[PDB]
C-alpha cells in the first residue's frame, strides 16, 4: 500500500532535503526533533494515504494536500498515485500565513504539469 516518490528540477539537483540535511549537521535532537517531524508525517502518508488525513494533513486552497503540528511548512500533492512528493519548504510568521505562499504554494503545478509529461 501507498509508495511515495521524490521529484525532478533543473540539474536535476533538488534541495528539498538540506532542510532534512544540515539539521544532520547540527547537534543531537533539537535539530532532529525539528525533523523527526515528517519521518512521522511522510511515514504517516504511505500508511494512511489521507484517510484521515486531517487534522494535520492540511488544505488551504485549489487542488490539495498536506501537513504538521508546530511552526510551519508545506502545501503539497499530486494525483497519480499512491505517491506524489515535490517542492520546497521555507518558514514563517503565521498565523496569517500567506496570501502570497498560496502562490508560492502553487508556483507548483508547473510541477504536476508538463513536468509530469
Amino acid at each position: 500500500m501507498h509508495n511515495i516518490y521524490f521529484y525532478k528540477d533543473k540539474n536535476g539537483n533538488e534541495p528539498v532535503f538540506d532542510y532534512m540535511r544540515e539539521l544532520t549537521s547540527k547537534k543531537g535532537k533539537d535539530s532532529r526533533i525539528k525533523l523527526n517531524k515528517i519521518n512521522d508525517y511522510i511515514e504517516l502518508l504511505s500508511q494512511h494515504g489521507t484517510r484521515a488525513g486531517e487534522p494535520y494533513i492540511k488544505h488551504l486552497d485549489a487542488e490539495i494536500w498536506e501537513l504538521r503540528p508546530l511552526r510551519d511548512r508545506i502545501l503539497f500533492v499530486a494525483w497519480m498515485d499512491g505517491s506524489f512528493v515535490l517542492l520546497h519548504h521555507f518558514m514563517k510568521r503565521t498565523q496569517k500565513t500567506p496570501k502570497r505562499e498560496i502562490e508560492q504554494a502553487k508556483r507548483e503545478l508547473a510541477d504536476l504539469k508538463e513536468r509530469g509529461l
Partner: protein, 86 residues
C-alpha cells in the same frame, strides 16, 4: 526518488523505529477520531488517561509511558505485542 530509500539514508534502523511507533499510535488515534467517531474526551472517559497526556500522545512530543500508552490502546481494543526483526 523514493521514500524508503531516503528514509534509510537520513535515518537507519536507529529512530525509524521510534517513528514507526509514533506513526502507529497516531493512526489508531486518528482512525478512532475519524472512522469510529470516538472523541478525545470520551477517550479520557473510557481509559482514565489525562486527555492532555493523550494529546501529547498523538503529537510526536517525545515518548509517553509504556503504561499510559497501553490503557489508551486498550480502550480502542488494541495492545502492543513483542515481535521479531525484519
Amino acid at each position: 526518488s523514493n521514500w524508503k530509500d531516503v528514509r534509510a539514508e537520513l535515518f537507519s534502523k536507529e529512530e525509524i523505529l521510534e517513528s514507526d511507533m509514533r506513526v502507529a499510535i497516531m493512526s489508531e488515534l486518528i482512525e478512532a477520531r475519524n472512522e469510529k467517531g470516538i472523541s478525545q474526551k470520551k477517550l479520557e472517559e473510557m481509559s482514565g488517561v489525562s486527555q492532555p497526556v493523550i494529546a501529547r500522545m498523538e503529537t510526536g512530543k517525545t515518548s509517553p509511558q509504556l503504561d499510559t500508552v497501553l490503557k489508551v490502546l486498550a480502550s480502542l481494543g488494541k495492545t502492543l505485542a513483542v515481535v521479531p526483526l525484519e
